[PDB]
């Protein structure tokens, strides 16, 4: 579940959580010291006080206006004093409850509503990045390991588990927020008392040890970032990104963990009405030290090249074809995706740059190509792939990739336009580099198809492409497209320098799709429509957790998409269906039937 | 209380003085330890090493945390009670009788 | 509610016993019986709530 | 707590004797009752703490 929104880096959510923490500090509770006061006894105590003050006042008026002056009046005084003791206890409890209900509850419910409203988007972003990091870690191997890596895992697993569980639990108990509201406040206060309790093994201790293991202040001077980079850099790991992007994603996930932990800690200390400590300083210190560790001791030793993550056995016709993967004037290629669900297709992302290689979210055009398998794979008569890794200098961004399969050989040419780092404009100063001749590699003819690349070919965040190269392994009959990114520069200039960062993530979905609400996730079919009272939204149906369109008798669900098309231009249709369907791309005027 | 607070601040400063006088030696020796540890990138992990690490890392982590945080707070120190909040919380969590104290 | 009932019942018993031990005036005893009946109503409400809790 | 209770019980008894044996019947006496009641609240808190400590 990707998100088309500027992911502001560690600086982004760090400053967001700092603002939330300052706001929490600004919230005034007052006499929030009587926590052990059942708020569900307000009516009981109020009734008792109202019914007892009358008797107390009756006795007072009797002893005052009364003309009796004797030890009998002294006994009446003692009786009135005992009634006064009972009434005063009841009234103290009632006053505490009323203060807590009319000063301590509204402030905190508003504060927690704001906290959750602000944590929403951060949680979305960091959850997507956590999914990606978990995929990477699944692709890792920790069976035959080094002593330092093993020590880092030993030292970081308990604190990681604790912090993750506490963050998730606090988020759940806040979203939980009558008797239900009071029970939820009681649960929140229990969690806060547990988080803030004074013990050396407290939540704060685990936070500090997590930081010490992230920076390398453990037994062996080994930072978790170094072991992460060492595990992710090995040859076995095949991911959709470079080492820079993968270790930066690791850092993002763990720093977001820490920041949310500090936020929960502040919220708990405020909920319990405890002395403030201002963890913004400590949060910033930790995050900045970890970013500096990454920038100094980790980032320089990483490779900013990303290749194909997967391979697929396929065949391709020997019919010669020209392909030109180009970007519109002023745009730049920032990523690709080879998908072969049923047919081989290539998504290509184009976007204008803004500054320091930042990609523009508004300009994120997506083009589609279909003749990639017939171009990268031979059918029956061998193939000759020219292989050469191009590497343009800095300030040059690839714009065109020209594949020409004149004969049974494959030869690509790349063009790179000059890009000004200060501004966001790409001038028309072009450098053209081809696949050098002396280094070609031949795949012999084989009945079994060759292994075409497959997967997402792009950095963890869409960045310009510096160089592009093809490689072919004859023994394994593999083909790889290795591109080079500018993520190191974009990070050194925006995030690792504590400046406004703007990063986009590969959408993992055909943005160029012309069928609005194709996945049919919005329950209200404003785009689609039903002609007759049937064929409705079957929520149980669809790709696992979605809302499929359904048809029963003779009423078919239709959607108008005539305008967003072109004449005689090729198109690709795709759809999942269950049962005995009938799909038709039909024109009301004329009986022409495009797809049936 | 007014004769207590300054006396305790002076005592903490006098402690930190000699503590820092000592800390330089162990800092250099731990630097040498880290130098020898960097060479462990080629020694694979054995069951004995795995067990010893998994057994010592909790106590070591907690002891190092307590020591370094006490030093940090005593250095930051140099009503006052509002400033000694972290030090008092640390002292209350460190001198507490517990099953896992 | 148990503590409240105990204290209120002790107060009411002390009052009633001390006023029955020696009756002095008409208006005084009248007002004493009035406030004692009010205290008895309060104690009855407290005991009703306590018995409701016990039944729960 | 024992010193505080021993020193406040005298004032409480003085106020009680003043309001009882005294022939004043006015809102002045009502305010004196309020004052005695506040002093009695303080004394009762002190005495509850002292009783708990003595029992323990």
Numbering used by the authors:
A (entry chain D): 14 to 190, 202 to 620
B (entry chain A): 114 to 191, 204 to 226
C (entry chain C), D (entry chain B): 58 to 113
From the paper:
In addition, Bt secretes to the medium numerous vegetative insecticidal proteins (Vip) that have been classified into three different families. Notably, members of the Vip3 family have shown to have a broad-spectrum activity against Lepidoptera4 and, since they target binding sites different to those of Cry proteins in the insect membranes, they are considered a good complement to the action of these toxins. Vip3 proteins are synthesized in an inactive state, as protoxins, and they require to be activated by proteases present in the midgut tract of the insect. To shed light on some of these questions, we have determined the near-atomic resolution structures of Vip3Aa in the protoxin and activated states by cryo-electron microscopy (cryo-EM).
Interestingly, the three-dimensional reconstruction, which converged at a global resolution of 2.9 Å, revealed that the Vip3 tetramer assembles into a pyramid-shaped structure where the N-terminal region forms the core and apex, and the C-terminal domains are exposed to the solvent. The cryo-EM structure of the protoxin reveals key insights into the molecular architecture of the protein, and shows that Vip3 is composed of five distinct domains, confirming earlier predictions. Domain I extends from the N-terminus to the primary protease cleavage site (K198), and contains four long, highly curved α-helices (α1–α4). The first helix is markedly amphipathic, and the second and third helices form an antiparallel bundle that adopts a different configuration in the outer (chains A and C) and inner monomers (chains B and D). In particular, the variable length of the α1–α2 loop allows the second and third helices of the internal monomers to rotate ∼90° compared with the external ones. This rotation further increases the curvature and tension of this element and leads to the formation of an eight-helix bundle that protrudes as a stalk from the tetrameric core formed by the subsequent domain. Notably, this second domain, composed of five α helices, embodies the core of the tetramer and plays a structural role mainly through two extended loops (comprising residues 221–226 and 239–247, respectively) that project toward the adjacent subunit and stabilize the Vip3 oligomer. In sharp contrast, the C-terminal region of Vip3 is composed of three globular domains that are mostly solvent exposed and do not show any interactions between different monomers. Domain III comprises residues 328–532 and contains three antiparallel β-sheets that form a β-prism fold strikingly similar to that found in members of the Cry insecticidal δ-endotoxins26. Notably, these two domains bear similar CBM (carbohydrate-binding module) folds that are connected by a long linker.
